[PDB]
Amino acid sequence: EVQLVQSGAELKKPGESLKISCKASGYTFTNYWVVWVRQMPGEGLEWMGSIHPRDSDARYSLSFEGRVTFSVDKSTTTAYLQWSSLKVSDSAIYYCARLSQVSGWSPWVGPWGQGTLVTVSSASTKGPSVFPLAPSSKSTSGGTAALGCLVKDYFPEPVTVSWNSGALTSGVHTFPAVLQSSGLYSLSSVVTVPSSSLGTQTYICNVNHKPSNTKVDKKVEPKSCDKLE
């Protein structure tokens, strides 16, 4: 299987240098161009340029040539993208990808790495608090119960949330992060499950925030409320 696996999300300050990586596998590294593509969240794809591992032939779009350097390490079949001095405006997701080509037809981009989110900021990282959103009658209808985790007060993006270490994916809604007036992000991840499973099935959200090395597993336990005094 042809794969490109990129390094994790980064928080850096303006003026710092940064090198992000893209590990290629499953194909002959020196036979294909590697390409780099920028995307600001919710914006379009931007071609940055390409580098060929066989001779480190690097092509840069004019928008990026002054500021970024492509390189490779053939012995580890890894491609690199390096800034010498980051700016706030460099905040974006960065994709690496292979260039592919059938016969003499013009090439296309694929497969792709999963992208590396780079945030350039003066602010220090803050790790999230994780709180249960417990299923109850207030979150139940028609034999379905909703439950979740609140992932509150972190910086920068991203956090990942899985349920039951990935076994539970149907009915999951992990909401886009939204800024609070504190300047910190918050989101909830919710899932709907059969209400009859609540006594039987354990539900755990697995939250990871790489920039702060925060990894939390939160059991979410059902609540029963008699609504009496």
Binding site: W33, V35, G44, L45, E46, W47, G49, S50, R59, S61, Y95, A97, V102, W105, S106, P107, W108, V109, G110, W112, G113, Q114, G115, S129, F131, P132, L133, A134, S136, K138, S139, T140, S141, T144, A146, G148, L150, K152, H173, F175, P176, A177, V178, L179, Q180, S186, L187, S188, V190, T192, K223, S224, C225, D226, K227
Partner: protein
């Protein structure tokens, strides 16, 4: 220097509709043109290369046409899972392979009312001195929804924020969270916390409420 102009920037269509996306090049580029599909939170995926050649594994409802400076991506029978942003790209230049601006394709489906659920603050969060109340609107359509908070029947403003998911790839609905955040001290001054939801799918507004202390 080849500029790719893509149109429209967004569109909406019903399941089964024929969708047409156009890409124009600032100069002729023969058939050196690719189309990609990018779903939310994922890397793009090539659909078509060389203007009209369909990639293996791509459904036959996708087709590319054109040559020179005008190209078209056609989805012949739009499916819910086709919700995505589509991009063209020229590969005629010497490795200066620029993309079009993207076309966001959204699905029109029938009105669907939200399921409304409410979550009081956790005891763990209250320990830490803050109180977040979460109102969840699940699987509704259209995206427009009005969510109001009332605390002891007093309408709140300025202490809540909303987040909405992207359209679901299977049923084309939205889900939305509205989170009311108060200090623990402010939360403990009141009893009745209620989220009131107004939506096309509801004949009248739905309120979900709880009483602080009821558990």
């Amino acid at each position: 220097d080849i500029v790719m102009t893509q149109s429209p920037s967004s569109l909406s269509a019903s399941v089964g509709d024929r969708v047409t996306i156009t890409c124009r090049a600032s100069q002729s580029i023969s058939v050196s043109l690719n189309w990609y599909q990018q779903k939310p939170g994922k890397a793009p995926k090539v659909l078509i290369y060389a203007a009209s050649r369909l990639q293996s594994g791509i459904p036959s409802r996708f087709s590319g046409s054109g040559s020179g400076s005008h190209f078209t991506l056609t989805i012949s029978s739009l499916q819910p899972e086709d919700f995505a942003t589509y991009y063209c790209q020229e590969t005629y230049s010497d490795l200066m392979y620029t993309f079009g601006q993207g076309t966001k394709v959204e699905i029109k489906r029938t009105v669907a009312a939200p399921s409304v659920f409410i979550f009081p603050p956790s005891d763990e969060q209250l320990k830490s001195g803050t109180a977040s109340v979460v109102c969840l609107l699940n699987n509704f359509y259209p995206r427009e929804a009005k969510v109001q908070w009332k605390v002891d029947n007093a309408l709140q403003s300025g202490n809540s924020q909303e987040s909405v998911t992207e359209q679901d790839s299977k049923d084309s609905t939205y889900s939305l969270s509205s989170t009311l955040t108060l200090s623990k001290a402010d939360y403990e001054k009141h009893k009745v916390y209620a989220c009131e939801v107004t939506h096309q799918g509801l004949s009248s507004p739905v309120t979900k409420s709880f009483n602080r202390g009821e558990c």
